Antibody, heavy 120, light 107 residues
Framework: EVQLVESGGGLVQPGGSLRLSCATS????????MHWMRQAPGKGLEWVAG????????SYADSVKGRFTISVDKSKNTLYLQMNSLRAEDTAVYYC?????????????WGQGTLVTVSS | DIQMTQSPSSLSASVGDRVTITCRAS??????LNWYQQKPGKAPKLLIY???TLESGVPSRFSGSGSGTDYTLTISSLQPEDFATYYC?????????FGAGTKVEIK
């Protein structure tokens, strides 16, 4: 089946950088747009960044614009999120998720989450 | 961002009970409203999309209705496995935005 598997993450100090990965399988990679969501501890879900792999269209939430970059490796079927100049407010569980169609317009598959903590 | 308001933010009920969770958007969302369940430590899972369509495998005790700005999720007979947090999300305008969650707690 379709599976989204994230890795990367762990703990860094303010100013640090990490690169999250979301490896997919089970479907034609360029046919679905992919998004990063986060859930800061005890809060709800918040959208972070999206990319359409067909034409390379990307979009970012105002809190991360300029510091994060979303990208894809189409030969490895992997989604990435490069996070630079991290700060303590970026602590959260980050989820990648697939968007079904553009009765559509919903997230149909979610990755298992990976934790990023920013602290000294 | 279209703002989404979920209510109640928490409720206490017992097994067997019927309950309705509500989500109001700040403008007409044109039925692009979806529901997710999330248990502690786990990723969200889709229950219902486009207001009323149940994802395959989701129990028939779950149903959804609504139109314009107002949308609801009803569980006809709460089971032990249903005590969890629920989120609605609108897909009408980008970025996608979520309600703040409704915690269903045991009484």
């Amino acid at each position: 089946e379709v599976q989204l598997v994230e890795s990367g993450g762990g703990l860094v100090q303010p100013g640090g950088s990490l690169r999250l990965s979301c490896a997919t399988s089970g479907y034609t990679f360029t046919e679905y747009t992919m998004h990063w969501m986060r859930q800061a501890p005890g809060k709800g879900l918040e959208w972070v960044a999206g990319i359409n792999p067909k034409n390379g269209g990307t979009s970012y939430a105002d809190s991360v614009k300029g510091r994060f970059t979303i990208s894809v490796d189409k030969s490895k079927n992997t989604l990435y999120l490069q996070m630079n100049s991290l700060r303590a407010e970026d602590t959260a569980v980050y989820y990648c998720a697939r968007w079904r169609g553009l009765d559509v317009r919903y997230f149909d598959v979610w990755g298992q989450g990976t934790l990023v903590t920013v602290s000294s | 961002d279209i703002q989404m308001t979920q209510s109640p933010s928490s409720l206490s009920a017992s097994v067997g009970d019927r309950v309705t969770i509500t989500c109001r958007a700040s403008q007409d969302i044109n039925n692009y409203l979806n529901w997710y369940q999330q248990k502690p430590g786990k990723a969200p899972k889709l229950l219902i999309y486009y207001t009323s369509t149940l994802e395959s495998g989701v129990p028939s005790r779950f149903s959804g209705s609504g139109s314009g700005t107002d949308y609801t999720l009803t569980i006809s007979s709460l089971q032990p496995e249903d005590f969890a947090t629920y989120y609605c999300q609108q897909g009408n305008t980008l970025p996608p935005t979520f309600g703040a969650g409704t915690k269903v707690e045991i009484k």
